[PDB]
Structure formats: structure tokens, C-alpha cells
Ligand binder design. Sequence first.
Ligand code: CL
Ligand code: ZN
Ligand code: ZN
Length: 65
Amino acid sequence: GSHMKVVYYRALYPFESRSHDEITIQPGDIVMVDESQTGEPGWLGGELKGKTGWFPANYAEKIPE
Ligand SMILES: [Cl-]
Ligand SMILES: [Zn+2]
Ligand SMILES: [Zn+2]
């Protein structure tokens, strides 16, 4: 994917990671996001609890700065 200026997303729906490059999120988790892979809806990539990876972009919401 592509790097972007670091931003924070709050998870809205649960997602369970399966591959190395995915992360698990639960509603309310805050992810520090620095990557995207464009798609419909595509993927966002970032760090949560010491792990890094993709999660589906429509499963979280951008937190205003
Ligand atoms: Cl797609
Ligand atoms: Zn493995
Ligand atoms: Zn992959």
C-alpha cells in the first residue's frame, strides 16, 4: 500500500486477523494508522497493541484531530 500522515481510527466492528499482515480489532480499539490500500472499501494499515497490519477500511472511523 501507500504511506500517509499518521492518523488515528476507532474500530467500529470486530475483525479477526488470519494472515501475518492483518491485525485483530474490537469495537472501541484505537489504531495508529499510517498505510492504506485503495479499494472498495479497501484496507487501512497500522499499529495496535504492539502488532501491525491491515484491517478493512470500513470497519473503523477516522478520529478528528
Ligand atoms: Cl476492491
Ligand atoms: Zn506463520
Ligand atoms: Zn496480505
